[PDB]
Amino acid sequence: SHMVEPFLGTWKLVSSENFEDYMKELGVNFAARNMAGLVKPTVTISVDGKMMTIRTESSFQDTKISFKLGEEFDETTADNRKVKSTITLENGSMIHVQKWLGKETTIKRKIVDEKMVVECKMNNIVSTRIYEKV
Numbered sequence: 001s002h003m004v005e006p007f008l009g010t011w012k013l014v015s016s017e018n019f020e021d022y023m024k025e026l027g028v029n030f031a032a033r034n035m036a037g038l039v040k041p042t043v044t045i046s047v048d049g050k051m052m053t054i055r056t057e058s059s060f061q062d063t064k065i066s067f068k069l070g071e072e073f074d075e076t077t078a079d080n081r082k083v084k085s086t087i088t089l090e091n092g093s094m095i096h097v098q099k100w101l102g103k104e105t106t107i108k109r110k111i112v113d114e115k116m117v118v119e120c121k122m123n124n125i126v127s128t129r130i131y132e133k134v
């Protein structure tokens, strides 16, 4: 397994653009939007054989997912949506699709200059979050 290797590690958020409207588009209630909005999460990406784990830790939230690449799985998101998630590697990006209630959002991560640039998109609203390797 070579294609995941650049994303393996511990990443700490350092910048965020338009996260408020992305969450607004997602339906996150306004109280939760300021819990998520004023915090810098640490995201940990790891592999244990067949299995990948992506842990997100906050002051507030401490959620994580485990999955095999390209195998849909059930996920409860931090805002309590019950989604169907599929995570692939495509063109050197890691792509996470969530589908729920006939809605979809995607989270794309790519390594640029040793930083992890994460693009969150729903319905033409885009948020860009950039993490630094710890």
Ligand SMILES: CCCCCCCCCCCCCC(=O)O
Binding pocket: 023, 026, 028, 032, 033, 035, 036, 043, 060, 061, 077, 078, 079, 107, 118, 120, 129
């Ligand atoms: C626990 C407080 C509620 C937070 C709700 C927003 C989370 C929904 C999806 C956020 C995905 C951010 C992805 C990332 O930057 O790694």
